[PDB]
Each structure stands twice: as C-alpha cells, then as structure tokens.
C-alpha cells in the first residue's frame, strides 16, 4: 500500500479561496469525482486513483479547510462545504460525473446527486452517512468518543486541543496499522490547533436523533432519493465495518435499486487504507457499463 502522493497540485479559486485537487487521466469522457470526508483529504484516494486514471479522468478535491485547500474563516458546517463543493464543480466546468464518495464526502455527493440527478452517471460509495435515529443505533466502536465530541466544551478540547480525530479516530478506524509516514500526511493540514475547526464541526453535524435538524432533513431527503433512483450504484463494505457492518450491507442489497456490492475483506471505516486495490480495480471494472 503506497504512502507517497505523486500527484501534481492543481488549484482553482472558489468563492475567494483556493481549493487544491488531483487531476489525472484522459481529458475527455465522463470524469470520476472522488470526495473524501473527516479528517482526511485527497490523500485517502491516492492508491485508488491509479486504477481508474488509465481509462477516466480523476478529480479529487480537498474540501475547504482540509488538505492543501485554503482555510477561510468559516464555521465549516455542512452547508459551508456544500457551497464550496458546488462552486468547485462549476469552476471546473464539469457537466456529467461519476461520484466516488465516503463519510462526509458521501453526504456531499448524495446531496449534489439529488439536486443534479441528470448529471450523475453512477455512484460508488462506502461507509456513508445516513440518519441514525438513536445513539443505541450509532456504531458501538468509539461511540462514547462521538458522544463526547458533541458535548459542549469537552468536544473542542478533544478535537481542537488534543487532535483526537487525527491521532485516535483515524488509526482506530483502519484495521491495518497506519505508518508514521501516512500519519504525517494526514497531520500536515492540522499542525496548528486553530486549523482544526472543520474536524470538530463535522462530528457536530452528524445526523443523530434528529439533530442538527437541517442536516437531518437533507440526509433523509437524499436517502429517499437513493432508494428511488435508477442510477447505477456500487457499494464497498468491510468487516466488521463501522457505519456499514455486514448486516447493513445486507439491508442495502435488499432495498436499493441497481446496486452492486463488493466485499473488501477486513475493514472498519477508512476502507481505502485497508484494501485500495480491490476498491480501485472494481471501480475500474464497473465504469464501462455506465455507458
Ligand atoms: Cl465526523
Ligand atoms: Mg487567495
Ligand atoms: Mg493538469
Ligand atoms: Mg495552503
Ligand atoms: Mg488483507
């Protein structure tokens, strides 16, 4: 599993801020847009993109305040990310896309797809966000930490002062041990505590027990859309998984239209770090049939 990030930096101005992105692959055809979540960046896709680039353009932005993108003075709520990703996609002139999405990247991607359904040719996803009605249904592994992240005062000390989303959640949610080199790539955007606002706001935006109400309603809306959409869907899942354990992959197989699923072996949440080759090779095999 490679640790380098051998991608030439690209930048585009978006609502006054520079956003960094990977851009590789042929200059025509439908582009494949890769959307990371918390607390990662385009680095999470580094070993997946090379499987897809031979046949399709690959675009992987760093969300605002993350990766090599700029750090505007935002709250970094989901609605801020929606604005910056919408403007990123328009600034690149993208028309139709295939989405490859994870974590908060999946909330962004599914919300964009519901609003722009004519422009989405397929969605590959993994360990994605859906509304969780009670804490008892939130995944048990690290559950008390997520409760504390959403507790006033306590959560900021954990995430902002102690950097626990990077130093604890991220390695705990990969089955294989992340190396120090990989950890240093993930640490780089957050070396100062004043850069860590997005990492704290994200878990405070998760749709749990109806709160926050605005994210809850938007996630319920894209899940209704997903259950009715004919779009081709590709779900990657691992075991024991975090948000999508085997029994949840089964419920997806039994409910979602036009779905193919791929088991990746051992995995928790950041499945890309456990088996990037199965993820990238199966995306590559599935793309031709999107016509
Ligand atoms: Cl989060
Ligand atoms: Mg500037
Ligand atoms: Mg270029
Ligand atoms: Mg910078
Ligand atoms: Mg293995």
Author numbering: 4 to 294
Paste lines from the article:
The target protein used in this study is the computationally stabilized haloalkane dehalogenase DhaA115 designed previously using the web server FireProt. Eleven mutations that were originally introduced in the wild type increased its apparent melting temperature (Tmapp) to approx. 73 °C (ΔTmapp ∼ 23 °C), making it the most stable haloalkane dehalogenase to date. First, DhaA115 displays activity toward a broad range of halogenated substrates, many of which are toxic and carcinogenic compounds persistent in the environment, e.g., 1,2-dichloroethane and 1,2-dibromoethane. This makes the enzyme particularly valuable for biotechnological applications that detoxify and degrade harmful pollutants.
Moreover, the removal of 3 mutations possessing a low probability of substitution (D11P, A212D, and L221I) from DhaA222 resulted in a further increase of thermostability by 1 °C (DhaA231). The analysis supported our conclusions about the disruptive mutations and, more importantly, succeeded in identifying three additional false positives, as demonstrated by the improved stability of DhaA231. We obtained diffraction-quality crystals of DhaA223 and DhaA231 enzymes that belonged to the space groups P1211 and P212121 and diffracted at 1.5 and 1.3 Å resolution, respectively. The positioning of catalytic pentad residues was not disturbed, which is a prerequisite for efficient catalysis. Here, we show that the protein backbones of DhaA223 and DhaA231 superpose well with that of the DhaA115, although some minor changes are observed in the hinge regions between the helical cap domain and the hydrolase core. The crystal structures of DhaA223 and DhaA231 thus suggest that stabilization was achieved via strengthening intricate networks of residue-to-residue interactions, stabilizing the αβα-sandwich architecture. The resistance to urea-induced denaturation increased in the order of DhaA115 < DhaA222 < DhaA223 < DhaA231 and the best fit in all four cases was achieved using the three-state model of unfolding (black lines). We show that the mutations designed by FireProt and PROSS stabilized the native state of DhaA115 and increased the unfolding energy barrier, shifting their maximal activity temperatures above 65 °C. We also observe that the stabilization of DhaA is accompanied by the destabilization of an intermediate state based on the increasing cooperativity of unfolding (most noticeably for DhaA231). The increased turnovers of DhaA222 and DhaA231 stem from a decrease in the transition state’s energy barrier (7 and 6 kJ/mol, respectively).
